[PDB]
Amino acid sequence: HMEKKIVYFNKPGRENTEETLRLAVERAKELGIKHLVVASSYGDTAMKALEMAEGLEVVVVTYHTGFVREGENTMPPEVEEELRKRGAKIVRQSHILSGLERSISRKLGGVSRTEAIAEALRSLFGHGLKVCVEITIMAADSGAIPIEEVVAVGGRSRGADTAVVIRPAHMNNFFDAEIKEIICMPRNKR
Amino acid sequence: HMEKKIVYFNKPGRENTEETLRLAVERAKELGIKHLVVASSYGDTAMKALEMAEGLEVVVVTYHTGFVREGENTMPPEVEEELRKRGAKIVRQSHILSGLERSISRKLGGVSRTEAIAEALRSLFGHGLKVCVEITIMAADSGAIPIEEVVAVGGRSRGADTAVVIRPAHMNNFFDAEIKEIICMPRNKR
Amino acid sequence: HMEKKIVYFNKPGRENTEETLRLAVERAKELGIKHLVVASSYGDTAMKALEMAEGLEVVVVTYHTGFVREGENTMPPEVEEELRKRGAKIVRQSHILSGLERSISRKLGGVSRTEAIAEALRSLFGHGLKVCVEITIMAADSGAIPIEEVVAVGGRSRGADTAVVIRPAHMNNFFDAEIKEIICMPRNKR
Amino acid sequence: HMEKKIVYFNKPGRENTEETLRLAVERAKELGIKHLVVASSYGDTAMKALEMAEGLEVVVVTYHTGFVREGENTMPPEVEEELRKRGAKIVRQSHILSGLERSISRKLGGVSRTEAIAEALRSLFGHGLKVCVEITIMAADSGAIPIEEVVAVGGRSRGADTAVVIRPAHMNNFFDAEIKEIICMPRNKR
Amino acid sequence: HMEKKIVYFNKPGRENTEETLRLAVERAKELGIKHLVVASSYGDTAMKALEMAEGLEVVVVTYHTGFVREGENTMPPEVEEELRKRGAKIVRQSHILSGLERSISRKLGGVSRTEAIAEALRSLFGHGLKVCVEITIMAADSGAIPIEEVVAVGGRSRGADTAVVIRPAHMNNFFDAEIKEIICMPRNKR
Amino acid sequence: HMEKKIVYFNKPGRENTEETLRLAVERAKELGIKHLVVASSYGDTAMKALEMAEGLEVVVVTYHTGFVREGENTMPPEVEEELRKRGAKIVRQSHILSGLERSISRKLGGVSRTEAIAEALRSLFGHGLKVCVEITIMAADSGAIPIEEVVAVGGRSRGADTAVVIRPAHMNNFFDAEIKEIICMPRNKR
Ligand SMILES: Cc1cc2nc3c(=O)[nH]c(=O)nc-3n(C[C@H](O)[C@H](O)[C@H](O)COP(=O)(O)O)c2cc1C
Ligand SMILES: Cc1cc2nc3c(=O)[nH]c(=O)nc-3n(C[C@H](O)[C@H](O)[C@H](O)COP(=O)(O)O)c2cc1C
Ligand SMILES: Cc1cc2nc3c(=O)[nH]c(=O)nc-3n(C[C@H](O)[C@H](O)[C@H](O)COP(=O)(O)O)c2cc1C
Ligand SMILES: Cc1cc2nc3c(=O)[nH]c(=O)nc-3n(C[C@H](O)[C@H](O)[C@H](O)COP(=O)(O)O)c2cc1C
Ligand SMILES: Cc1cc2nc3c(=O)[nH]c(=O)nc-3n(C[C@H](O)[C@H](O)[C@H](O)COP(=O)(O)O)c2cc1C
Ligand SMILES: Cc1cc2nc3c(=O)[nH]c(=O)nc-3n(C[C@H](O)[C@H](O)[C@H](O)COP(=O)(O)O)c2cc1C
């Protein structure tokens, strides 16, 4: 057995961003992990991650085109260009913990099994954990990370509040993904 | 923020039982928690929990009647009688992270949203975490615990390997349940 | 073939309680049945059942804790204590003809297969029949009745209006449950 | 309240056909019901129903074309012609307690809510009751019966073993259908 | 390979009726097809189809009884009588691209797999194509057409705007149905 | 109304690749369409598309990483590099007409609404049409195409056999996608 630190935040959400990234990088370095997978909708957390990465490869997972308005991206080109210049990979694809079922539930009614899994992760462990899982599958399916332990970072709405060590998998073998360690999360999710 | 210990086990399953209970009791006492909710199919973990509880109220959650063979219980009367003599509460009811949908998926085919949630908890966090959640809802619905933070304990197949601090909820408000802290779990679930 | 009496009530609901119990007990005694399984939310029907049981074992199935408000019971302690003094068993657990799917349908939308079965029983045969089935599975899963024919009693909202002879089963073998006889029910369910 | 006869058969299935029809006609006449809705796959029960109808209008509900082999009917033309000559209506359409979902569950896997309702009716009340319900909705949707109480007759595999008094409804208002009385059914469904 | 004409209409709906029928009949005759399957709710398109059929057998598929109001038909008797006099077959049965699931989604919430298929056909190819498919399965299940290529015609709300050459199938082998050719459809569905 | 050519192939599959691309490019140029979205698993169809594009922008949609083996890509780096050199965009992301539901149906059983839509497209219109739709949503979600009419190309297993003019949409507004024209498809899908 391994006794490790876990950090619990008093509140969820964006105030926790810098500490989450610090702890994420700290654990990655202890484990010899190479990839830091970070959710960033508009680019703030991505930029902070690059500043703090200390040599880790940063894989930024952003919103699918059309998440807010069809055909539009939340992260603007000038931000994306700077992230790429600083060596980030950018993953932009469908959100795999809802998928096409979101169109059906929104327009016609009734949620799917996938959406139920998403909501149980949100409720039990917080939105940031749900996102950690979701972005890891997306990064894997998009070919941005290998099937090796990575550190994933997500949050509630904006910024970051949760970091995990996770073994990735794909949309066709989701039950092979595994949370190895929880580095930090809000004690209070809501 | 709160920096706490989390213990990761190298293997899942029954070898971790005594350490899981020790750590569960340790955290409950730090937090002023009164109830220890423990999964025990045949009674072994329940008996160990009572020995180690140091004044906590132990709520034992066992298998539903008929889990293996219709009309039969896995925990035998002599064990149940001893647990009750030592002050345990016993919860015996339907397993709420499958429910009647298990009859449908087994006989007719296709899993439900509830069963999908269960499997995602098993795969991401291990069977013991899934059980921690499940038994907490069952204990709440059966009227054995209040809606206050409790420590829940479960494992892979037999014994215990996972302990959490959890805010309970019921079958009709499941998304109000929340994992506040993870005390210990297997690093490797399988 | 066996020609038997069935009693059809003109209206559903609580006005039928005493006659339903009378007919339930009458049929149980004809068949040599030992257990009378009765739904009672607040305790009225349970108390009447005990008065009328004539030596049958009464198994009272009540609401899950949290059915109305989280952490609260509809049947109050003083009633529960009196029922136990008079020899009733009390079953309090999750309602198995909805289960965790009720949280999903209420919060996120869309009903499950289990909830669809429940509604078809309510519509075709009345709420009291649906309850008869539901409480029999619950009583079985909670270990309160054997897998032998029992008489079950339920109603529309309050009291009783339907009684059946039923072969129990569990949440994992629901399709083995069987209605052997319908003793009484409302001709008009609504 | 109304005290009536119900007849319970010792075995399910085809041996009960003549008695089921006799009892069905008897009850229809007591109630002033005009329509007798009868399941007949190959025509035997339909022919017997016409012989025994004593002035009731017989609505025969048969298998959908393709139930056994695509493009083929189980009831042959010579039988259909004789039934029509004797004044029967013939309903031949999709089986509405499975519908298109049967193609999905058979080819791709997983049963629907509709198929789950069907199976619960089969298990709790027997196949003949399930059929009584199903054929009443089909007869209504096909325009063969009005929305008035009718007597419906069905069975296990062949012949008849169950008769009910039922208020019809359609595929779009199924929960308005109601079983008013159960005239006869097998005590033992299987 | 076969180079053929397809006609795209600028608008969906009833304005396209006469041209759709003309093109449908034209293609049927080129292929030696015998049956023209036409959706007609109130009878207008059916009557026009008979006028234009030039010796094809017209199979009219109308609304299920109760589509608007329980127990009522949209096509009135005087129209049905005239269609039959002119040699049409009339199919009136449950709408198989929703079925009983429509009662569940309307009353209780959440759409089925069948309803999701229907909506995807409506959105991708227009309501008229969805109807072409639906009425072909209905006509097959009702025994009105053989399992041979037919031309099917449907539209948006009223009239016709889409015609296809289709290989029929039944509710239990839906995935054997196949669109061989699209004769005409709206370029703009909405 | 617009009378246009549609080409029907006698057989599905890879033999149709060059003609499908020729017809796709022909129609795009007639309409002033700028983007040709092409499915290519291993790269063959992509390379042919670039050769034949005549100035259109080619958006290649390939398999998700892990489609065959976790962590592996079907299109090898040397092919991807050449496609990029020749000006193709490459979309690699989760397959949105199955998504995470594929893990659930494969491991646990039962298909989703999304998978049912996919299968209905495959059966009615052929695998190549299904792919045309799927890759258009993926290309949109990945930010590779605007919400303007595009020509999409897909096939049965390998190569191409179907081309459409399609208005894209995203995973959250799928029912806004629309097939404007079918350029070519197999008359016989299987
Ligand atoms: C693919 C994706 C899915 C997300 N899902 C959720 C969600 O379910 N709940 C939530 O609160 N935030 C969600 N987020 C937000 C992230 O957790 C994170 O707070 C955000 O991307 C950071 O953006 P910023 O760097 O611009 O602040 C999601 C983000 C992404 C990229
Ligand atoms: C309600 C209930 C559900 C359970 N579900 C699972 C499960 O999903 N997977 C698993 O490996 N063990 C499961 N278990 C087993 C428990 O996690 C634990 O290992 C067991 O109850 C301990 O029994 P013992 O004390 O007799 O060893 C379940 C136990 C209970 C009581
Ligand atoms: C587990 C459970 C489920 C019930 N479900 C329903 C229901 O679906 N519809 C309904 O009208 N009543 C339902 N009831 C109410 C019972 O049928 C019965 O009328 C009630 O429990 C009697 O309570 P009383 O004795 O306090 O009057 C349910 C009761 C229980 C205990
Ligand atoms: C629409 C339809 C559905 C049926 N479904 C079932 C069924 O679920 N189970 C069963 O045992 N028989 C089923 N049957 C059979 C009937 O209950 C009845 O036994 C049969 O139609 C009588 O045919 P016969 O007169 O040729 O003997 C069905 C029949 C029809 C027409
Ligand atoms: C079984 C059936 C299902 C139909 N479903 C739809 C539908 O989904 N959307 C729609 O716009 N029209 C639908 N229609 C309407 C038809 O496509 C067609 O426009 C109509 O039946 C023509 O009726 P009329 O001849 O009285 O104008 C449906 C019609 C039938 C008979
Ligand atoms: C995202 C994606 C999904 C696909 N789904 C299917 C499918 O459902 N059925 C099928 O026969 N082919 C499917 N294909 C194969 C394509 O239609 C096409 O034949 C193939 O990608 C061409 O690869 P090649 O250029 O290496 O021959 C799919 C391809 C992709 C990229």
mmCIF file of C-alpha atoms and ligand atoms in Angstrom, chain D residues 14 39-46 61-63 95 122 127-128 130-131 134-135 138 154-160, ligand 4:
data_model
loop_
_atom_site.group_PDB
_atom_site.id
_atom_site.type_symbol
_atom_site.label_atom_id
_atom_site.label_comp_id
_atom_site.label_asym_id
_atom_site.label_seq_id
_atom_site.Cartn_x
_atom_site.Cartn_y
_atom_site.Cartn_z
ATOM 1 C CA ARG D 14 -55.513 -24.962 -25.561
ATOM 2 C CA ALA D 39 -57.163 -14.142 -30.971
ATOM 3 C CA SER D 40 -56.849 -16.804 -33.655
ATOM 4 C CA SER D 41 -53.539 -17.525 -35.383
ATOM 5 C CA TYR D 42 -54.682 -20.287 -37.729
ATOM 6 C CA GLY D 43 -58.472 -19.939 -37.329
ATOM 7 C CA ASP D 44 -59.560 -22.696 -34.904
ATOM 8 C CA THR D 45 -60.568 -20.461 -32.013
ATOM 9 C CA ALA D 46 -62.269 -18.042 -34.401
ATOM 10 C CA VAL D 61 -57.466 -10.808 -34.460
ATOM 11 C CA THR D 62 -54.842 -12.872 -36.238
ATOM 12 C CA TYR D 63 -51.083 -12.732 -36.726
ATOM 13 C CA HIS D 95 -48.572 -6.753 -32.952
ATOM 14 C CA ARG D 122 -47.207 -12.703 -19.562
ATOM 15 C CA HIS D 127 -49.783 -15.162 -22.008
ATOM 16 C CA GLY D 128 -53.531 -15.279 -22.606
ATOM 17 C CA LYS D 130 -51.255 -10.328 -22.432
ATOM 18 C CA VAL D 131 -52.919 -11.305 -25.689
ATOM 19 C CA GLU D 134 -52.775 -6.652 -27.180
ATOM 20 C CA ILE D 135 -55.567 -7.701 -29.503
ATOM 21 C CA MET D 138 -55.002 -3.723 -32.330
ATOM 22 C CA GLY D 154 -56.653 -15.063 -25.802
ATOM 23 C CA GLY D 155 -54.534 -18.002 -24.803
ATOM 24 C CA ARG D 156 -51.213 -19.669 -24.363
ATOM 25 C CA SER D 157 -49.792 -20.529 -27.816
ATOM 26 C CA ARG D 158 -52.981 -22.058 -29.298
ATOM 27 C CA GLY D 159 -56.639 -21.894 -28.401
ATOM 28 C CA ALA D 160 -57.931 -19.769 -25.575
HETATM 29 C C1 LIG G 4 -51.586 -10.681 -32.098
HETATM 30 C C2 LIG G 4 -51.298 -11.983 -31.376
HETATM 31 C C3 LIG G 4 -50.340 -12.047 -30.371
HETATM 32 C C4 LIG G 4 -50.133 -13.223 -29.640
HETATM 33 N N1 LIG G 4 -49.154 -13.261 -28.649
HETATM 34 C C5 LIG G 4 -48.996 -14.434 -27.919
HETATM 35 C C6 LIG G 4 -48.107 -14.505 -26.889
HETATM 36 O O1 LIG G 4 -47.470 -13.472 -26.456
HETATM 37 N N2 LIG G 4 -47.973 -15.680 -26.191
HETATM 38 C C7 LIG G 4 -48.703 -16.801 -26.517
HETATM 39 O O2 LIG G 4 -48.513 -17.830 -25.846
HETATM 40 N N3 LIG G 4 -49.609 -16.721 -27.519
HETATM 41 C C8 LIG G 4 -49.772 -15.569 -28.209
HETATM 42 N N4 LIG G 4 -50.721 -15.518 -29.200
HETATM 43 C C9 LIG G 4 -51.593 -16.708 -29.439
HETATM 44 C C10 LIG G 4 -53.016 -16.467 -28.937
HETATM 45 O O3 LIG G 4 -53.069 -16.161 -27.552
HETATM 46 C C11 LIG G 4 -53.966 -17.665 -29.233
HETATM 47 O O4 LIG G 4 -53.572 -18.788 -28.447
HETATM 48 C C12 LIG G 4 -53.897 -18.017 -30.712
HETATM 49 O O5 LIG G 4 -53.995 -16.880 -31.539
HETATM 50 C C13 LIG G 4 -55.054 -18.953 -31.071
HETATM 51 O O6 LIG G 4 -54.838 -19.413 -32.385
HETATM 52 P P1 LIG G 4 -55.730 -20.705 -32.937
HETATM 53 O O7 LIG G 4 -57.148 -20.274 -32.875
HETATM 54 O O8 LIG G 4 -55.253 -20.906 -34.331
HETATM 55 O O9 LIG G 4 -55.441 -21.819 -31.973
HETATM 56 C C14 LIG G 4 -50.910 -14.360 -29.932
HETATM 57 C C15 LIG G 4 -51.865 -14.271 -30.913
HETATM 58 C C16 LIG G 4 -52.067 -13.110 -31.637
HETATM 59 C C17 LIG G 4 -53.119 -13.089 -32.718
#
